[model samples]
Each structure stands twice: as structure tokens, then as C-alpha cells.
Target: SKEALIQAIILQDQERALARFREPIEGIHFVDYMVESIVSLTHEAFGQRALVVEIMAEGMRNPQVAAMLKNKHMTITEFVAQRMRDAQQKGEISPDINTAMTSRLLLDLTYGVLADIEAEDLAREASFAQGLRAMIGGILT
Candidate 1:
């Protein structure tokens, strides 16, 4: 049952998810690819510092967090810290204390919102899509 749940979470659907889990090698590689895609895109858009914290504090901590990370070897704290440092260096914020502080605060805000989402039990896809639509609607006015 747990394995089935893992498959569903990892694949985001039943058919492919279960089949992928049958082969350990494929499962591991798929997870690697998944993390890479998630982290890379997040880093691209929000920088490493913000993205790491967001992923850890928001996405990772949720009770029903995705199956991919739950099964992966990566630790949440270590991953976030490493990524945060990488992002800071990339953003050229390391040299400026003020800018680093500001950036950290912004990242904190992002994480806070994420925390709210997780705490609200809004982990399901349908709820997220609905919430997103409402958010977009509010902004469109």
C-alpha cells in the first residue's frame, strides 16, 4: 500500500507511476531528473536562495509532500542551505550585507506563503488549481 502511494505521488498519476517504480534503477533516475527539473526551474526564476527555502520550508515539509522527495536521499535542511548559498553567489548578493538581508527577507516571505499553503492542507492538485485561478482572477481586476 505504501509503495503504491509512493508510486502515485511520484508519477502524479497511477499507470506510469506504478510501472516506473517496478525498476529500481528507473525509479532512482526518474527522481534525479525530477529534482533537477524542480530545482533548476525554481533557481532560474527565484534564484537559489529563495528557491531552496521555498522548496524546503514549503514543498518539503508538507505532510503529503510529493513521493519523489520522500524517497530520495537528500535531506531537506542540507539541500536548502546548499542551494541558498549557490543562489546568493549567483545573484551577487554575497558581498553586500544589506542586499543579502533584503533578499533573505523576501525569501522568507515566499516561504511564509508556502507554509500557509501547506498548513491549510491544500496539497491536492485540484485545490491548488482552483486557488491559482482565484489568485489570477483577483490580479486581473
Candidate 2:
């Protein structure tokens, strides 16, 4: 199901190939491959938010990359937030903090990471693989 969801998102990304999805579709594909890797690397760490971030981080490193990951993030965020609210109504996430804020934080992190990726000057050592790991570690925990 996750793989299918990922495939759907990848197809949407390929559509915007002109402007935003400029830097090699292969990179976005690389990202898709990376997402699969993340899942494999951290089998039990899969969560809607974490998966979305995993997808989004690929985009952050490049506009083309982000374009591919964008739709999935948007779709997943909306879906998860609605479900979160539903769950909250039934005692899921603590109502102490608004789930909306949590969603926003995930988005911000996505954008921030994207910026870093685009800048291409952060830390050469800060590869997408490492970034994804750090992000997943922070978000999932």
C-alpha cells in the first residue's frame, strides 16, 4: 500500500517536468528509491508523517525533487490531520497540543530541509541519506 501510494505520487511529480521538476526526474526517482530505502532501513519506523517527511526531504534538496514529493505530502498531511482530529475526538493524540501545529511543524521542517538541499552549500557531508535519518529520528521519536 505504501509502495502504491508512493507510485501515485511519483506519477504526479512527473507531470510538472517543465519548471519545478527541472533537475533530472531521475533524482526524484532516486528519492523514491530512497524512501523505499528508509522504510527498509527502519522497517517499524513507518508513520504517515515520517513517510511524508521522507518523501519531502527528497524534494527539499532540489525543486524538481520537491515537486515530486509535494503532492504526496499535501495529500498525506490533510488525510492525517483529519484522522488525527477524529482520533483526538476518540482519545488518540493528546489534545494538549493542537495537531494542526504538529502538521505545520512537519511542513516547516520539510521546507527547511528543502532549502538546505537547494542551497547545496550546507555541509557536503550532509547527504540526503543522513538528512533523512536525522529527520526521521527527530520526527518519529
Candidate 3:
């Protein structure tokens, strides 16, 4: 199913691709869920190199895909920032932290690792997630 979803994304079949995880899974942090999904799909469906190239090619050649991605980016940033605001309200994170900037950086960092998927290694993915959480912890506290 995940492989088919990746094929749909590569083919620029918006309906099929969007059907996969259309709504973020319940009770999981959005970024964490996405990082795992992306890494797993990239490794299992397309080789890292092919997946990276396909993503770039589709984004460049397909207006629909490009538009969807742009919207998703904005939504993800807003979602992350809102989570940060909640954390601040609950005294889980520092009020001094800039939620907007932190959200952008977190997305950048997660995607940076995802784009570099060199192997189908869940351990490595876990390490990246842990490293990101540590970095965020330092920023928040």
C-alpha cells in the first residue's frame, strides 16, 4: 500500500497519493509521523537516489504537485508552530523561543534527513529523530 502510494506520488496522481494518510494519524506528532513515512517509502519503493530525483522532477514539471506541496508546506509550518504555542502555554517550553522560526527549522531538519535516505535503515531513522528531538529540547528549554 505504501509502495503504491509512493508510485502515485511519483506519477503525480494527486487523488491516489492524497488518499494515503490524507489526514495525519491520530495521536502522533505530525512531523514525526511524516518523517517515518517518508523515509520508509523512499527506501522501500524507490531507491534513495531515484526517490530524490523523482520528487524534484515532479515538483518542477507538475503544477498540481507543486501547488499541493506549497500548501502542505504552509500547513505543516503552521501546525508545528501551533504545537509549540500549546507547549509554551503548558510551560513545557520556554516563552522566549520563536515558534515560527522553530517550526521552519524543524521541518527543514527533518526533510534534510529524509532526503538523504541512503539505506532502508530504521535504526538510522530513529537516530535522526532522536537527534532532532534533542536539538528541539535544547532550543525549548
Q: Could you say which candidate leads in lDDT?
A: 3
Give me the displacement of residue 14 in model 3, in angstroms: 11
Ranking by lDDT: 3, 2, 1
- All candidates: TM-score: 0.22, 0.35, 0.55
Residue 33: error of model 3 in Å?
9.8
The regions of model 3 sitting more than 4 angstroms off are 1-53, 60-66, 119-130
> Between which residue pairs do clashes occur in model 1?
none
lDDT of each candidate versus the true structure: 0.36, 0.45, 0.57
lDDT of 3 by residue, 38-104 (tens): 4444344545446545665676676765665666556666766776676667666678988788777
Candidate 1 residue-wise lDDT, 1-141, digit = tens: 454554444343222223332332322322232223222222232343343344354435555544444443233323333433443455422423343333334334334443352423343445554554444223211
- Show pairs that collide, candidate 3: none
* Candidate 1: C-alpha RMSD after superposition: 14.6
For model 1 the TM-score comes to 0.22
